[PDB]
Each structure stands twice: as C-alpha cells, then as structure tokens.
Amino acid sequence: CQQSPVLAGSATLVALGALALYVAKPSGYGKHTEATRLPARAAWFLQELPSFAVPAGILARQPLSLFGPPGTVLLGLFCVHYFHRTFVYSLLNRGRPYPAILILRGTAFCTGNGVLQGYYLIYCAEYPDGWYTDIRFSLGVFLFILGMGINIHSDYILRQLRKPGEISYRIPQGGLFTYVSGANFLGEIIEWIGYALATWSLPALAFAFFSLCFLGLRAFHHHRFYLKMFEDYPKSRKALIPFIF
Ligand SMILES: CCCCCCCC/C=C\CCCCCCCC(=O)OC[C@H](O)CO
C-alpha cells in the first residue's frame, strides 16, 4: 500500500476546495452561468459515472460476503450513492444545457476521487474488530443515510419545480427548504461528514472538506440569487446551516 499517492490525492482534493473559495464566483453551470453546450441529463451522466464504475470495478474483484471487512461495505455505500447520482438523478435531471468544457474536468474529478476512495478503503484502511458497534460507525452510518435522505428528497423537490425543457427558477418550497436555500447541499454535506466518520479515513475527510467548501459556496450564491430575484422570498431562510449561515 503506497502511502504517497494517497496523501497527494487528499491534498489536491483539499487544495481544490481552497481554490473554489479563492475564485469566490460559482462554477457557473446553473443560475449564474448566463452550440457550446449539451443536454444536462447526458452531462451529469458522463461526469458522475466514473465515481460509480471505478468503485464498482474495484468491488467486483472482492469476495461476496457481508460478513467481511468494514472498508468494503463502506465502499459499497460509496457505490450506492453514485449509482443514484448517475442512473437516477442525472438521467431524470431537468436542468438547462451544460457547458461541454466542464464535463472533462468534472469527469476528471470523479475519476481521481473514485480511484482515491476505492483504493484507500480496500488496500489501506484498517479497522478494529468491534467497528460495527463503535460510535463512529453507528453514528457515521446514521449521518450518511440521514444526509442522503435529505439530499435526494431536496433534489426531487427541485426537479418538480420544472417541466422537462423548461428554463425557469421557482422558489423552492417544502421540507427543509423552509429553513435553508440549499437543502440538497445540506444533505450531501451531512452525507460525506458521516461517511468520513464511518470510515475514519483521511481521504474521506478531505472529500468531505471539499464538498463543504464547494457546495457551501454554491449554497450561498443560490441564497444570494433568491434574495436578489424574489422580493417575497422567505427571509427567515438561511443559505446552508439552519439558523446560522
Ligand atoms: C485519534 C483521533 C484524533 C482526532 C479526533 C477527532 C474527533 C472528531 C472531531 C471533529 C471531526 C468531526 C467532523 C468530521 C467527522 C470525523 C471524520 C474524521 O475526522 O476522521 C479522520 C480520522 O481522524 C483520521 O485518523
């Protein structure tokens, strides 16, 4: 198990997070983005696919027994998330046309990240014997399914705000959106923090930190957008963290 490529992957993954904050301006593929584009369903399909296929391939070489290592089962949860993100979320996506340029970078991210998380958990990660009863797992797994529930529940609420083909932004109403503008982001952030907690691993903590930086900035700009574009937007709402930010 080479420890040098691992520390480097977590470094870039963190440096990326820092870089996204330095630019301050959003990644520009949704709201603040206004023949160089392609359908968003195909875009997010291609972008997020590596973060599924690579861990799926890594898993496919391991024995089939749930009565086995914790690092494998956790990698399965990573695979379960990006299965939804690719084949369910992305293929049902109702977003505007996506910039072709960003796909290769988005794909590059999900490739390296998929390699990092998958390689570490199998070849590097080492867990004690009573991990499934440990508070880090029992809470970490809890936070994971909690955040995923929130992330998917909110992405669906957002999806039902449009008919396919529509170019429009309506005020997101419904569960947990009543408190924060970026409810789906809140969920995903909760999801990876718990994931880092359940794996107790450096590269997972890094990806969680990136997601916090990226989606946390994305949430803020979304919050800005609503306050800028809707005179009757609920002013009790916050950007990301309820009653705080
Ligand atoms: C020996 C342990 C010393 C450090 C104790 C820290 C306790 C957790 C405190 C804050 C993190 C909470 C939010 C993030 C969830 C935890 C994931 C994590 O940090 O795991 C990395 C692990 O420590 C790599 O050895």
Residue numbers in the entry: 5 to 38, 44 to 254
Give verbatim excerpts from the published study on this entry.
SRD5α2 is highly expressed in male reproductive systems to convert testosterone to 5α-dihydrotestosterone (DHT), the major steroid hormone for androgen receptor. SRD5αs belong to a large group of eukaryotic membrane-embedded steroid reductases, which also include sterol reductases such as the 7-dehydrocholesterol reductase (DHCR7) that catalyzes the last step in cholesterol biosynthesis in humans. Although these steroid/sterol reductases share very little sequence similarity, they all use NADPH as the cofactor to reduce specific carbon-carbon double bonds in their steroid substrates. To our knowledge, the reported structure of human SRD5α2 with the dualsteric ligand NADP-DHF represents the first structure of eukaryotic membrane-embedded steroid reductase.
Human SRD5α2 was expressed in insect Sf9 cells and purified in the presence of finasteride and crystallized in lipidic mesophase with a space group of P622. The structure was determined to 2.8-Å resolution by molecular replacement based on a structural model from de novo prediction since we failed to use anomalous diffraction data to solve the structure. Unlike the bacterial sterol reductase MaSR121, the structure of SRD5α2 contains 7 TMs (TM1-7) connected by 6 loops (L1-6). In addition, the N-terminal residue C5N (superscripts indicate location of the residues hereafter) forms a disulfide bond with C133L4 in loop 4 (L4), suggesting an ER luminal location of the N-terminal side because of the reducing environment of the cytosol. The structure of SRD5α2 revealed a large cavity inside the 7-TM domain at the cytosolic side formed by all 7 TMs and L1, L3 and L5. The cavity is completely occluded from the cytosol with only one opening on the side of 7-TM domain between TM1 and TM4. Strikingly, after ligand fitting, the distance between the nicotinamide C-4 atom of NADPH and the C-2 atom of finasteride is shorter than 2Å, suggesting the formation of a covalent bond. The same study indicated that SRD5α2 could catalyze the hydride transfer from NADPH to finasteride, leading to the formation of a covalent bond between the nicotinamide C-4 atom of NADPH and the C-2 atom of finasteride17, highly consistent with our structural observation. It is likely that SRD5α2 took endogenous NADPH during recombinant protein expression to catalyze the reaction with finasteride supplemented in protein buffers to generate the NADP-DHF intermediate, which was stable enough to be captured in our SRD5α2 crystals. In contrast to the highly polar environment for NADP, the binding pocket of DHF is largely hydrophobic, where the core ring structure of DHF interacts with hydrophobic residues from TMs 1, 2, 4 and 7. In our structure, both the C-3 carbonyl and the N-4 amine groups of DHF form hydrogen bonds with E57TM2.
